[PDB]
UniProtKB/Swiss-Prot annotation:
Pfam families for the chain: NUDIX_2
Gene: NUDT21
Similarity comment: Belongs to the Nudix hydrolase family. CPSF5 subfamily.
Function: Component of the cleavage factor Im (CFIm) complex that functions as an activator of the pre-mRNA 3'-end cleavage and polyadenylation processing required for the maturation of pre-mRNA into functional mRNAs. CFIm contributes to the recruitment of multiprotein complexes on specific sequences on the pre-mRNA 3'-end, so called cleavage and polyadenylation signals (pA signals). Most pre-mRNAs contain multiple pA signals, resulting in alternative cleavage and polyadenylation (APA) producing mRNAs with variable 3'-end formation.
Tissues of expression: Expressed in the heart, brain, placenta, lung, liver, skeletal muscle, kidney and pancreas.
Regions that span the bilayer: none
Residue segments, region Necessary for interactions with PAPOLA and PABPN1: 51-130
Effect of substituting R33S: Reduces affinity for UGUA RNA by 99%
Protein's UniProt name: Cleavage and polyadenylation specificity factor subunit 5
Keyword annotations of the record: Acetylation, Cytoplasm, Differentiation, Methylation, mRNA processing, Nucleus, Phosphoprotein, RNA-binding
Subcellular location(s) per record: Nucleus; Cytoplasm
Principal localisation: nucleus
Subunit structure: Homodimer (via N- and C-terminus); binds RNA as homodimer. Component of the cleavage factor Im (CFIm) complex which is a heterotetramer composed of two subunits of NUDT21/CPSF5 and two subunits of CPSF6 or CPSF7 or a heterodimer of CPSF6 and CPSF7. The cleavage factor Im (CFIm) complex associates with the CPSF and CSTF complexes to promote the assembly of the core mRNA 3'-processing machinery. Interacts with CPSF6 (via the RRM domain); this interaction is direct and enhances binding to RNA. Interacts with CPSF7. Interacts with FIP1L1; this interaction occurs in a RNA sequence-specific manner.
Length: 197
């Protein structure tokens, strides 16, 4: 009886958060977001997204790194795969596009664990951790992965975003604040054996 995955965590003060130019969303509104999902579904089928969960600690208290757009939405680092693109290579590409350095030194992203799977049945906000009853053509499949960080790193945060460290207690039972995927991270992370370096 030791069946848990062992993960190294480092202090938040081990990481440098630099700045770079703004990164703009492909969609200028909720309505434009669901119009483009409908157009691409007709051309290339189900949307495939990938998201990274990056963990740090301070004084042995785990925190998840979240992207905050101005003072509005919280999001995980991630995005949309291209057709025929590998999911793990894709997440590594997207995390470099978002947080990768202005001096063009490469982060060594380490991805070895699936956290979870969510499905969007319609061109509407609702997402579920399973394909709902009667749904044969889901509109989006989202995959979450645990990203093991190095001991130290410099991240370049686009100037229209803040990288924030959220403690697990603040996420727990807080779907109104964070939505159904981020608010269930405490439950999804509980299986790991974290080492507080
Ligand atoms: Zn301490
Ligand atoms: Zn699927």
């Amino acid at each position: 009886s030791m069946l848990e995955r062992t993960i190294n965590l480092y202090p938040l003060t081990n990481y440098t958060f630099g700045t770079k130019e703004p990164l703009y969303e492909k969609d200028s509104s909720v309505a434009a977001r669901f119009q483009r999902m409908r157009e691409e579904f007709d051309k290339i089928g189900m949307r495939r997204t990938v998201e990274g969960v990056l963990i740090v600690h301070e004084h042995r208290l785990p925190h998840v790194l979240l992207l905050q757009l101005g003072t509005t939405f919280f999001k995980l680092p991630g995005g949309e795969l291209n057709p025929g693109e590998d999911e793990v290579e894709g997440l590594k590409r997207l995390m470099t596009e978002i947080l990768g350095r202005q001096d063009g030194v490469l982060q060594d992203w380490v991805i070895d664990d699936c956290i979870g799977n969510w499905w969007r049945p319609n061109f509407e906000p609702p997402q579920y951790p399973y394909i709902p009853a009667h749904i044969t053509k889901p509109k989006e499949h989202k995959k979450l992965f645990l990203v093991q960080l190095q001991e130290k790193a410099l991240f370049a945060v686009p100037k229209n975003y803040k990288l924030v460290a959220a403690p697990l207690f603040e996420l727990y039972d807080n779907a109104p604040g964070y939505g159904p995927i981020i608010s269930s991270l405490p439950q999804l992370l509980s299986r790991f054996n974290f080492i507080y370096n």
